[PDB]
Amino acid sequence: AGYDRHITIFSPEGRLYQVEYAFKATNQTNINSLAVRGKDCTVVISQKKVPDKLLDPTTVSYIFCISRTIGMVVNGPIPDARNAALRAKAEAAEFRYKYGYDMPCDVLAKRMANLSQIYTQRAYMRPLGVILTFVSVDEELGPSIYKTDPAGYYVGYKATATGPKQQEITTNLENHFKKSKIDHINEESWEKVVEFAITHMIDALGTEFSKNDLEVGVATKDKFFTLSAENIEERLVAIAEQD
């Protein structure tokens, strides 16, 4: 009876505790991330925290290059994040091979969400304790953000945030869009969109960032790439000369 809390079967309230607890695991890294759409680019920001001095900072990342065009940031333990990344890359490659074109961001999202829905229904598979945010500049849909959770749920966003202080970032972004009345950052250069991203990150979290406190990913037509500590510093300098 009390095992309705160990495997993914319904509780008398029609709940799936294991899926709920998997959601809890997503905040285990105490990292926050956010994504915004530019006029023709998509940006994803994510706090970078390297506590141990013995670690090689260059190998600590929660952002992944899934395909030439799809980028993915993960909120959750790194081992489950890497499991998701490998699968996503394989799915992305197979899709291109079978259907003749690049797998769209939203389709990859649906695919991964479906895989998640299954760990939710089959008892021998546990959910992955992660939230996946996919971004790209789709050839049909333009800048795109699709995010999936341990429940197998997914949807598109004008912008979104994830992590412990998710709510603060969300309301911050919400307010901005209630004001601008448009669903994206009306900027022509991704550099400025990245800057907007970081600025609001700071406002919402009430924190300052050095070049090694962040991690950035940018999606543009036919390409997704991550910035270097130096590309970031150049970003931080620019926002400084405005405040």
Binding site: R15, A113, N114, A123, K158
Partner: protein, 250 residues
């Protein structure tokens, strides 16, 4: 590795209840309300787009799905479960029917297929039942229009009109008052909009409401011309604008 869960996860209790089916139904009860109304010349299915956040793009999430060009579905309960049920339904309509008889399946048979998929998640080893109830509306030459409900157990029943989810009890009652066997499609749509208003707390418009109908053939939605016998799909999702136009005459 290897799924070693080859035994049922849904079994009979001393009272004769099937716990997991029951619990699944409870999950359905907590779900957003959805309904369907059958008119003399069409069927309408609708539900509320309960956007989980204003940053989310409610259009990128359809609760009303096309299964075949003459059949559509909506649900109440667990959205992810519904999504995979739709993929499986669309596919089974092909593998178990179109690829055999060269035509899409009649509503009752496709419903029968979905129901089977669901019944199996009630008895097969290592799984839990689907946490959803579907309302499937469609049309076929020899049966005309029809509306069906499919529950977690796999049971299904034909309806003239009904509602499922959160305020299903109240909504069903309101439908019993307004329904008659002489309703025209527009009338059903109107009744549907009224019934859905009682269930919606916040904003009520073409952007927060999702509604589709099964009516006449839309040759304009076919994509090609040249085959006299191909007149177009009877399934059509209403546009945000089409909904609002009807909300003014509420």
């Amino acid at each position: 590795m290897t799924d070693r869960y080859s035994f049922s996860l849904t079994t009979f209790s001393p009272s004769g209840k099937l716990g997991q089916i029951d619990y699944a139904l409870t999950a359905v009860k907590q779900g957003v309300t959805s309904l369907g109304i059958k008119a003399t010349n069409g069927v309408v299915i609708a539900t509320e787009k309960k956007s989980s956040s204003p940053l989310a793009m409610s259009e990128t999430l359809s609760k009303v799905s096309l299964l075949t060009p003459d059949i559509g579905a909506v649900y109440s309960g667990m959205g992810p479960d519904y999504r995979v049920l739709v993929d499986k339904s669309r596919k089974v309509a092909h593998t178990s029917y179109k690829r055999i008889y060269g035509e899409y399946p009649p509503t009752k048979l496709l419903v029968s297929e979905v129901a089977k998929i669901m019944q199996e998640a009630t008895q097969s080893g290592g799984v839990r039942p689907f946490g959803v109830s579907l309302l499937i509306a469609g049309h076929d030459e020899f049966n005309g229009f029809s509306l069906y409900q499919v529950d977690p157990s796999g049971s299904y029943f034909p309806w003239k009109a009904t509602a499922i989810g959160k305020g299903s009890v109240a909504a069903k009652t309101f439908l019993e008052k307004r329904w008659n066997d002489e309703l025209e499609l527009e009338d059903a749509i109107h009744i549907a909009l009224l019934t859905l208003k009682e269930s919606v707390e916040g904003e009520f418009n073409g952007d927060t409401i999702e509604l589709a109908i099964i009516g006449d053939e839309n040759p304009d939605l076919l994509g090609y011309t040249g085959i006299p016998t191909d007149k177009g799909p009877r399934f059509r999702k209403l546009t945000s604008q089409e909904i609002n136009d009807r909300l003014e005459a509420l």
